[PDB]
């Protein structure tokens, strides 16, 4: 594994480590299945996956926009001529409780009407906090960005299984106050609880301090 | 025991400010901290160090300075038996413990010195 050869001598550009380029690409955040109630609610979370939770918790305050993409198909590849609706419920607005609730025709919840044989839908969500930045760490006692509600358009149930995956890009990023990186396994999505019975050392070990 | 407290026995009334000087006489290798608190007249003596800190106080660490000076802002007497007497209370609190290495003595001593200020006067000469 260690090879002595091929030292590079020229310095690189500093633009690879800019704070925009560290979060620049779009990654999968949720996989939503709707087999044959009829509706799914997915409120927006960044800390759902262990990746990008460790990357956003390098800082204390972050401020960004978002851009969601909805790649939708059947459970195996297929695409049928089906009409779908993606309703975005803002913070402070009620969610749908069933498939034929009155919140589905609420005008202030913006919807997207696509077909499954289309290119995927794309939606930009602005900075939705009443503060000036999001914060992953709050020391006091009581970060919502909204909810996406997804259903098939109609008054009767459709004879198809829907499986969509959501991709999210992070735009116009500003970060504040760096912080040590998490070196213990996560337990819950809300609090930084760790397993205190066994503590993983940050480095792997060797036999002696002289045996390099 | 002071010369100020013996010349005040020759008069009736006096008013002015004082200054109290402390002097640590321990070994050079010892260190620590004391809290010299002063209570104004009419107030109560502090019960512990945390309430003595909220008043007028200095933090005298004797690893740096061998002497500190606390100034009483005003005292007053009008003697009549009884005296009309507005005086404060000085308290000495252990901020930290007494830190000492091997070979140096574990017990030290403080000397207290006292004098009057430039605005101290007295009147109505009286025989004692």
């Amino acid at each position: 594994n260690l090879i002595e050869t091929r030292c590079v001598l020229n310095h690189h550009s500093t633009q690879e480590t800019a704070i925009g380029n560290f979060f620049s690409r779009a990654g999968l955040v949720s996989i939503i299945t709707m087999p044959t109630d009829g509706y799914v609610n997915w409120d927006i979370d960044l800390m759902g996956y262990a990746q990008l939770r460790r990357k956003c918790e390098l800082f204390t305050y972050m401020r960004f926009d978002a851009e969601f993409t909805f790649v939708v198909a059947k459970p195996n590849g297929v695409l049928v001529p089906q009409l779908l609706q993606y309703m975005y419920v803002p913070p402070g607005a009620p969610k749908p409780t069933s498939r034929d609730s009155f919140a589905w025709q609420t005008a202030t919840n913006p919807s997207v009407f696509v077909k499954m044989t289309d290119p995927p839908a794309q939606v930009s969500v602005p900075f939705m906090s009443p503060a000036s930045a999001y914060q992953w760490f709050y020391d006091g006692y009581p970060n919502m960005m909204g909810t996406f509600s997804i259903r098939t358009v109609g008054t009767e149930k459709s004879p198809h299984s829907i499986t969509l995956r959501v991709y999210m890009r992070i735009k116009h990023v500003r970060a504040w106050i760096p912080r040590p990186l998490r070196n213990q396994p996560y337990l819950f999505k809300t609090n930084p609880n760790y397993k205190g019975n066994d503590i993983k050392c940050t480095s792997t070990s060797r036999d002696k301090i002289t045996t390099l | 025991s002071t010369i100020l407290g013996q010349l005040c026995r020759y008069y009736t009334q006096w008013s002015g400010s004082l200054e109290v000087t402390f002097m640590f006489a321990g070994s050079f290798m010892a260190t620590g901290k004391m809290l010299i608190a002063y209570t104004p007249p009419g107030g109560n003596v502090p019960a512990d160090r945390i309430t003595a800190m909220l008043g007028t106080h200095v933090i005298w660490d004797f690893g740096l300075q061998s002497s500190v000076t606390l100034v009483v802002p005003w005292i007053s007497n009008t003697h009549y038996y009884f005296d009309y007497y507005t005086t404060g209370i000085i308290t000495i609190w252990y901020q930290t413990n007494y830190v000492v290495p091997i070979g140096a003595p574990t017990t030290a001593y403080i000397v207290a010195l006292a004098a009057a200020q430039d605005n101290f006067t007295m009147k109505l000469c009286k025989d004692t």
Partner: protein, 209 residues
């Protein structure tokens, strides 16, 4: 050796131009300013560490304690001063660092310890799952008993809002951790004291009593 005096509070601290300003910013605006000297902690051979939460440490102390309990909004910087009193025959090293929004973790009285402060149970993970080895990315200062016995950090106001309540939200935490443990020979003073001195800088209150 100078002699600082702010208000009716006097400390004697040597003049040393090695202060650290947190992120290079001075505390500015958008009788509470004096020197508050906390209770003194004893550093022993098997001690692990201590922490204080701000501004929870001054909610029941002095006129700063009653201005927080009556007013609604609050905003201030701080000037923390941590000093040690040991001889030339003791040894050890402390790491004094601040950490904004220091949220602890279970393996409340522990989260809000007050004027006394609490002790760290697992100081290798800072009781929060983050390693002690990277704590120096925060505004920090080393107390090495070989060379210096003093540490001072100037902390400005760090929040997402310009004013905040003082009775629930704790802005930052001050961590004092013995990286190298204390050692001496038998017959010397077994417990070394550590004194914390806090002075608020540019404190504002906007809510009525």
């Amino acid at each position: 050796v100078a002699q600082l005096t702010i208000g009716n509070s006097t400390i004697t601290t040597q003049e040393a131009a090695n202060i650290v300003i947190a992120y290079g910013e001075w505390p500015e605006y958008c009788s509470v300013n004096r020197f508050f000297t906390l209770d003194t902690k004893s550093w022993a051979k098997d001690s692990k560490g201590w922490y204080w939460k701000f501004p929870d440490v001054l909610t029941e102390v002095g006129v700063f304690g009653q201005n927080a309990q009556f007013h609604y909004l609050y905003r201030s910087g701080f000037c923390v001063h941590v000093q040690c009193n040991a001889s030339k025959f003791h040894q050890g090293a402390l790491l004094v660092a601040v950490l904004p929004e220091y949220v602890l973790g279970t393996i409340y009285a522990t989260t809000q310890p007050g004027q006394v402060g609490a002790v760290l149970t697992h100081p290798y993970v800072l009781d929060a799952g983050i390693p002690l080895s990277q704590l120096t990315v925060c505004p920090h200062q080393w107390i090495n008993l070989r060379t210096n016995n003093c540490a001072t950090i100037i902390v400005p106001y760090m929040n997402t809002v310009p004013f905040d309540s003082a009775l629930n939200h704790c802005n930052f935490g001050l961590l004092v951790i013995p990286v190298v443990p204390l050692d001496f020979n038998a017959g010397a003073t077994s417990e070394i004291p550590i004194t914390v001195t806090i002075a608020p800088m540019c404190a504002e209150f906007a809510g009525l009593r």
